[PDB]
Design a binder for these strands. Structure first.
Length: 270
DNA sequence: CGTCCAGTCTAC
DNA sequence: TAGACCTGGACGG
């Protein structure tokens, strides 16, 4: 997922778990090389928030829950196939690698972190990744200042299409979003990052870094993805103007990732 | 059957 | 930097 997917996943956990009570331990698949979550409670609520391409779960025991336990926070990154689902306990999807189980009363459901390719990761801390910049969705003004303060950084030597993936400055921006963002401004993907950014110091490249992914969120649905029908997925394919679309050029950036664009590749093209 | 394609993380 | 980390769907023979 990218920021919209991480953001919509957090909204999903919050709405789906609002009137649910979990109990017991936090179960991990045998094959997952991520850490065992040391946590047990007779009764606890799960909530979420999203920051860029990371999602924080808070496991929050109720008054009187046993064993005695302070709230616990997990941060997740999704890599290529991470996701959250609420399923019936005996119908776990195949790659459900971490699982929170409802307590009686009611239907026994499982909140599952599902990650086919297992590029996703979680940490016990609860801290955001040091070095990741502010959320382009929820921290726009902080994100905007963080780029304009640091144009001197060597990151901005690189072509614009590569800089937009550097999560130190564009936390939340991934492959589809960089294509869609540059297509909106007809900015060649291999223009130099510093060149396009120095200008700003209406809608400019940094503003679109916020407004474009906000468009994905306001589709409702589950971004690139279909957790709420194939209808929501068709809604997304329709929103796209550039990424994967017929009549568009594509190249490889210096890290082998496909950038989609119209017309001028730009000066720093391979 | 085979190939190729879809975000970090870490060892050169 | 370049390869490593993974599974599965869409192709081509």
């Amino acid at each position: 997922g990218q920021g919209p997917e991480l953001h919509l996943a957090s909204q999903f956990v919050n709405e789906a778990c609002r009137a649910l009570v979990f109990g017991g331990c936090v179960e991990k698949s045998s094959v997952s090389r991520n850490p065992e979550v040391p946590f047990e409670s007779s009764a606890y609520r799960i909530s979420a928030s999203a920051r860029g391409k990371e999602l924080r779960l808070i496991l929050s025991p109720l008054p009187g829950a046993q064993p005695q336990q302070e709230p616990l926070a997990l941060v997740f990154r999704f890599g290529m196939s991470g996701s959250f689902q609420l399923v019936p306990r005996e119908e776990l999807p195949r790659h459900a690698h971490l699982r929170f189980y409802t307590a009686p009363p009611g239907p026994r459901l499982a909140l599952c972190f599902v990650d086919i390719r297992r590029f996703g990761r979680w940490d016990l801390g609860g801290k955001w990744q040091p070095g990741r910049g502010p959320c382009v969705l929820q921290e726009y003004q902080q994100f905007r200042e963080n780029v304009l303060r640091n144009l001197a950084d060597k990151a901005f030597d690189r072509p614009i299409c590569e800089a937009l993936l550097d999560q130190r400055f564009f936390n939340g921006i991934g492959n589809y979003l960089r294509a869609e963002i540059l297509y909106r401004l007809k900015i060649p993907p291999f223009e130099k990052a510093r060149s396009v950014l120095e200008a700003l110091q209406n809608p400019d490249l940094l503003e679109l870094c916020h407004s474009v992914p906000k468009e994905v969120v306001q589709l409702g649905g589950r971004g690139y993805g279909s957790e709420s029908g194939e209808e929501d997925f068709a809604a997304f394919r329709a929103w796209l103007r550039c990424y994967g679309m017929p009549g568009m050029s594509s190249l490889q950036d210096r890290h082998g990732r496909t950038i989609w664009f119209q017309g001028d590749p730009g000066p720093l093209a391979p």
